[model samples]
Target: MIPFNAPPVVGTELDYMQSAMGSGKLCGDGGFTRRCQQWLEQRFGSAKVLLTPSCTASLEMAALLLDIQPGDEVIMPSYTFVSTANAFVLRGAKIVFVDVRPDTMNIDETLIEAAITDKTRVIVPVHYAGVACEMDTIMALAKKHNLFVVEDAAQGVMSTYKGRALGTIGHIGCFSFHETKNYTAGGEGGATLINDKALIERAEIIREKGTNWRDIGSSYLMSDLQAAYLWAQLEAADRINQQRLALWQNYYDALAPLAKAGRIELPSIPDGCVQNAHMFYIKLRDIDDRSALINFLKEAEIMAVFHYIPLHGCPAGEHFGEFHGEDRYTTKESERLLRLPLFYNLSPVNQRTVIATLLNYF
Candidate 1:
């Protein structure tokens, strides 16, 4: 049976973990953690990178570092994981949910400016499926409005907009190393890319749970052991990226006919946005079509899945956030989207099976 995702496993994880254990320093900021954090800083060009226990923790660190206070407003697309809004909401910031563009399934940059208000402090752009949002417009709007931009680049490791990396484009950024991600730090981990150098020192203080004594904070550290596992993945990162991209291309090539025939819609990578192939998905005619295809794939022993339900519609979201404009494509397009089995280690044989099964379904 093919699973929707199998956590990436490179050859060196055990060796690194053994070394980390041997060092007798398994806390945060140990050798393994330093290696992994440095790898990200050098690779992504971020000013500072802090390893967190999870992307949720990275985002939370951002909320605290930004000093999100009561009644402050944060803007983001509703078509995202709950953590996107929850991070701000927990700090008493009201979430303003925007609509998404169906093509990229990213926040419609044009709509973002309209959502802004005097209370608006940050705009969180989630790089869906590793494809960037229209960051040029988002960044320009942030400047014009004197607002901060935080990129929730959870799925955007190795992705770039124009020539810049996903997490480095905004003032602050977050990346996930959860098991399902292309890379994994054991089973859970994340990093916050501190883009602005001024925030670096404060961010460290905050991560250590208000060491400054006057600042509000919490412990958001990822264990060095987890970093050891992630180091192995980073060592083989280029290889994994290439393998995933090849699989992505194979799916695109094989399914082009279905897309061209109007039977389904494939993902769109806007010009200058270099994606990391974090996921492979198709847009069915509707939710019904999506459900049926998923069942068919399941019957074939191949697991497929759906992504986020528009957070604005969820119960907690209703309490913490409100949609700024028309629902538009956020919910509708989300219903049509279905993710196929795509992972760093998924072999061509299994990928072909998934492709063929999808073809037969249509």
Candidate 2:
């Protein structure tokens, strides 16, 4: 059976983990943690990077750093993982749900302005499937309104927008190293990229649980073992990204004929955007067809799956936020979208099976 994802592992993970075990420190912010932090900071070219227990924690840190208060609205796409909205909502901010562009499944930058109000404090743009959002326009809007830009770049570790790294483009960017992602930090980990130098020190304090009790914070630091595991992966990131890119291209090429025949829609990458091939999803002809497709794949031992249920349509979303404009594409597109099996160890032989199975279905 083809699994949907497998955690990334390089040759050195076990060795690094052994080294970490011998270091006499298994807690957060240890020697291995510092090494990982330094590597991320240098690689992402951010003013500061704080390792966190999870991407959700990084986002919560962002909310705290921004001082999000009750009734303060934070605008974001409803088509993202709950963490995108929940982070700010936890800080007592009212969520303002926005639509997503059908092409990239990212927040509709054009509609963000219409949703902004006097109560708006932050604009959270989630980079879906490692594809970049329309960041230039979003940044301009944030500047005009004096609102913070917190980028939810969980799927965008190596992706770039107009040559700038996705996570580093916004004032604050959050990343995930979950097992399902292209990279993994011992199954669960995350990082916060502070582009604005002003937030660096405070971010450190927050990750340290308010080290000096100067501000409200939490225990968000990552474990040294996790850092060691991730450090090994980071060392092989380039090779992993290249392999994933090759797999993505293979899927696209193999499925292009089906898309052209009107049987499916392929993922789209906008100009100036370089994706990390984190996820490769296809949009079925109709939402109703998704269930059958998923079932068929499962029956064949292929693990194709669907992504997010529109947050605005969920119980939590309805309670925490409301959609601003029409639900133009968020709900419909989400229902039709199905993710294919793509991971670090997805062998070419297995990938061909996944592709052929998908093509055979259509």
Candidate 3:
């Protein structure tokens, strides 16, 4: 059976895991953790990279670092995982739900300016499907309004906007190493990239869980053992990246006819944006069409799935925040988007079978 996601296992993972076991410091910030942190720092060109328990934790840490007070506004697209809004909500910030660009499934940067109010504190541009949001406009808006930009780049580890890396461009960025991501740190992990150098010292302090009158932090560090596993993944990141990109290209090429016939819509990568092949999704005619296709693939023993259910529609979302503008594309596009199985170990032969199945459904 074709599974949705499988964590990559390189030959060196066992060796590193063994080494981590022998070190007697299997906690956080040990040798392995430092090595992983330094590697990401150099490669991604961030001021600092702190390992976290999950992307959710990293995002929470960002909210803490920014000192989001109650009633303060945090703007982001509604078509995203709950964690994105939950992070700020935990800090008592009012989430300002914005529309998404249907083509990229990212927050509509053009609409962000209208959503900003006196209470606006941050703009979160989630890099959906490893394809970047329009960073230049987002950054400029942040600058004009004097607001912080926190990139929820959970799927954009190796992706770039223009020439700069996705996470590094924003004031603070979050990356996930979950099993479903292109890279995995054992099974679940994340990294918080501190781009604005001013937050570096406090970030470290907060990560270690320091609290009192002037400080507030929590336990958000990843184990050294997981870092060891991550090192193995990074060592062969180039090879994995190419393989996934090849798979993505193959899907795009093979599905061209269907896209041309207006039967379905393909994923979009804007100019100067380089993706990491984290996800390959297609847009069906509507929710019913997508549901039918999903069942069709399932009957053939191939696993496929749909994505985010528009946070604005959730009950908690209503309690914590409200929609800023029209529900233009957030709900409409989410219902049509469906993800195909794409993972590190997905063979070309199996990928074609998935394509063939999808083609047959259309």
Candidate 4:
């Protein structure tokens, strides 16, 4: 079966793992971890990059660094993974979920201002499918209102907006290295980009458990083993990105006719936004068609899947936050979106099979 996702594994992984094991330090922030952090900092031009156990942990760190207090509000989109809201919610901050643009499946920059208030402490822009949100407009808004921008760039490691890396654009940006992502730090990992220079030292302290118990923090650092694995992947990131982009373009070209016929809607990339080809998805004509299409693909030995449930409609979301604007596109678009199989080392033959199966279904 062509599975929905697979973890990246370079031939050098075992060698790196052996070196890490022999280094006498398997804990966080060891030599391998330092190397990974330095690589990310240099590659992204970030002020500071700290590897974490997961993207959720990085986001939690951002919430802590921002000093998010009870009754504080964080503006974000409802059509996102729960980690986006859960991070700020854990800090007792209420989520103010805004509508997303149907085109890019990103948070609507225009609607962000209406949600802003004195209680709003932060604006979190989640780069869905590794495609950037309108960072220029969002940054301007944040500066005008004096609010913080915590970018949830979970799917956007190598993606850029107007030449700036996604995670480095905001005050604090979080990235995921989960098994299903374009790259993985072993099975799971993440990183926090501290773009604001002032937050660098404090971020380090927070990741190290509040500078040795003088303050409050948690064990959020990534292990040396995971860092070693990720380091090897980073070394080949350019090639991986290129291969994924080739697959992405192939899918787009092959499916353009179907989209034109109104059978489906393809992924959209805005001008000036350079994506990492992290995901390739399509929107069906209606939500009712999604289940059948997924079942069809599965029957053909090709696995496909639908994406998130609108966070605002979930139990925790209803209890923790309110939907700021009209549901508009967030809920509707989310229900119709389906993610195809795209991963590192996905062979051309397998990709053709996946694409052909989808075309056959239509």
Q: Root-mean-square deviation of each candidate, in angstroms? A: 1.0, 1.0, 1.3, 0.9
Estimate, for each residue in 141-241, the C-alpha lDDT of model 3 and write its tens digit. Answer: 99999999999999998899989998999889999989989889998899999999998888877987664134778888799999999999999899889
Write one digit per residue (lDDT tens) for candidate 2, span 1-362. 99888888677899999998998898988988888879878787877888899999899999999878899999998998998888888989999999899999999899999999999989999999999998889999999999899999999999999988878988999999999998899999999899999888887777766664777789987889998999899989999999999999999999999889888999999999999999899988677798899999999898888999999999989998999999989988998999999998889999998888887888
**lDDT for every model?**
0.91, 0.90, 0.91, 0.91
Model 1 C-alpha lDDT per residue in residues 1-362, reported as the tens digit of each score? 89999999887899999998998989887798888889999888999998999898899889988988999999999999888888888899999999999899999999998989999999999999999999889999999998989999999998999999999998899999999998899999999999998888889789786653756678787888999999999999899999999999999999999899988999999999999999988998789989999899999999999999999989988998999999989999999999988998788998888888988887
Q: Name model 4 segments beyond 4 Å from true.
A: none
So what's the TM-score on candidate 3? 0.98
Candidate 1 — what's its lDDT? 0.91
Total clashes in model 4, counting residue pairs 3 or more apart in sequence or in different chains? 0
- CA-RMSD of model 1: 1.0
Candidate 3, residue 306: Cα displacement in angstroms equals: 0.3
Worst 10 residues of 4 by lDDT: 207-216
- Greater-lDDT candidate between 2 and 4: 4
RMSD of 4: 0.9
TM-score of each: 0.98, 0.98, 0.98, 0.98
> Considering only N, C-alpha and C atoms within 3 Å, which residue pairs clash in candidate 1?
none
lDDT of 3 at 314: 93
Task: For candidate 1, give the lDDT of residue 167.
Answer: 94
